[PDB]
Enzyme design. Sequence first.
Site, PDB file in Angstrom:
ATOM      1  N   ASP A 244       4.433  -9.944   5.816  1.00 39.22           N
ATOM      2  CA  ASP A 244       3.099 -10.369   5.416  1.00 39.22           C
ATOM      3  C   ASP A 244       2.953 -10.358   3.857  1.00 39.22           C
ATOM      4  O   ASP A 244       3.590  -9.560   3.184  1.00 39.22           O
ATOM      5  CB  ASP A 244       2.134  -9.335   6.035  1.00 39.22           C
ATOM      6  CG  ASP A 244       0.795  -9.919   6.472  1.00 39.22           C
ATOM      7  OD1 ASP A 244       0.784 -10.960   7.154  1.00 39.22           O
ATOM      8  OD2 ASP A 244      -0.247  -9.293   6.144  1.00 39.22           O
TER       9      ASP A 244
ATOM     10  N   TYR B 292       1.158  -9.546   0.197  1.00 37.38           N
ATOM     11  CA  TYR B 292       0.251  -8.511  -0.287  1.00 37.38           C
ATOM     12  C   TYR B 292      -1.180  -8.999  -0.124  1.00 37.38           C
ATOM     13  O   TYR B 292      -1.462 -10.175  -0.384  1.00 37.38           O
ATOM     14  CB  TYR B 292       0.535  -8.225  -1.749  1.00 37.38           C
ATOM     15  CG  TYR B 292       1.894  -7.553  -1.954  1.00 37.38           C
ATOM     16  CD1 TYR B 292       2.079  -6.214  -1.593  1.00 37.38           C
ATOM     17  CD2 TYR B 292       2.974  -8.256  -2.507  1.00 37.38           C
ATOM     18  CE1 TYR B 292       3.320  -5.574  -1.775  1.00 37.38           C
ATOM     19  CE2 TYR B 292       4.233  -7.622  -2.692  1.00 37.38           C
ATOM     20  CZ  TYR B 292       4.392  -6.285  -2.320  1.00 37.38           C
ATOM     21  OH  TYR B 292       5.620  -5.643  -2.456  1.00 37.38           O
TER      22      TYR B 292
ATOM     23  N   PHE C 238       8.144  -9.599  -1.095  1.00 36.31           N
ATOM     24  CA  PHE C 238       8.250  -8.338  -1.853  1.00 36.31           C
ATOM     25  C   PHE C 238       7.795  -8.298  -3.324  1.00 36.31           C
ATOM     26  O   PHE C 238       7.299  -7.262  -3.791  1.00 36.31           O
ATOM     27  CB  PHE C 238       9.667  -7.764  -1.760  1.00 36.31           C
ATOM     28  CG  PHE C 238      10.080  -7.360  -0.350  1.00 36.31           C
ATOM     29  CD1 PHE C 238       9.591  -6.173   0.220  1.00 36.31           C
ATOM     30  CD2 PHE C 238      10.910  -8.183   0.410  1.00 36.31           C
ATOM     31  CE1 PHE C 238       9.921  -5.827   1.512  1.00 36.31           C
ATOM     32  CE2 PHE C 238      11.247  -7.831   1.721  1.00 36.31           C
ATOM     33  CZ  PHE C 238      10.752  -6.662   2.265  1.00 36.31           C
TER      34      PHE C 238
ATOM     35  N   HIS D 263      13.586  -0.455   6.996  1.00 37.80           N
ATOM     36  CA  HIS D 263      12.599  -0.973   6.047  1.00 37.80           C
ATOM     37  C   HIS D 263      12.536  -0.125   4.776  1.00 37.80           C
ATOM     38  O   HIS D 263      12.738   1.107   4.833  1.00 37.80           O
ATOM     39  CB  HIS D 263      11.222  -0.979   6.720  1.00 37.80           C
ATOM     40  CG  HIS D 263      10.213  -1.830   6.012  1.00 37.80           C
ATOM     41  ND1 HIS D 263       9.435  -1.359   4.971  1.00 37.80           N
ATOM     42  CD2 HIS D 263       9.901  -3.141   6.150  1.00 37.80           C
ATOM     43  CE1 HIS D 263       8.698  -2.347   4.493  1.00 37.80           C
ATOM     44  NE2 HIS D 263       8.962  -3.439   5.188  1.00 37.80           N
TER      45      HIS D 263
END
Length: 228
Positions: free
Chosen positions: A72, A74, A85, A194
């Site tokens: 997703d 930010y 990222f 992750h």
Amino acid sequence: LDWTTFRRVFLIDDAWRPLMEPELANPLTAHLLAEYNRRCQTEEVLPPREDVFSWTRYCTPDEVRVVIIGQDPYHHPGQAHGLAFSVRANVPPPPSLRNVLAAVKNCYPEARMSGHGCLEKWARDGVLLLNTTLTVKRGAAASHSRIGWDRFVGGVIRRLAARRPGLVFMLWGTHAQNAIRPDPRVHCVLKFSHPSPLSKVPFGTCQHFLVANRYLETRSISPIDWSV
């Protein structure tokens, strides 16, 4: 016709036309686009329209060497800019990103790190940073996860892998691993937990950046300079 307009709206680099244009023939792509438009009229959608497809501008499909999958974008103003990222220059890296950058430094003690979290340099050098969901309503994680972005992005990635054998894929966490499943015989598929500081395995121990460069080298491709 459909492409001419599509490109106009999101300012997409024409080099990506062969991987994306075929998606416009799916009636579901029109449903996706109409829903995105409706959401822009009623909520605060991030990232800005002009940044949604910024990933198409930094390199062509033929220049892609590594694919890193995100989930997703930010959801606070000023953070997301179209790449997985990455945060805009001058935005201190949040926790997960700090861990990705820490792992780069553990792999390459000589890498000169700027302290910033914008990954435009990697993008220009062939590192494709792609989220499976491209938009989000401000302050609400996964709010646009069911309108169909993952279907469209999945098609683009399938066509890319099909066209370009020998790509390196970095799949961090359960979502990315379930989302994309490239042929491990044709591509270098790397998996890890992750980057979140809440993971049981410390991401700083990941060696993907190093393994990717060794793979490229066995294939006569220049290595990626991971400093940023």
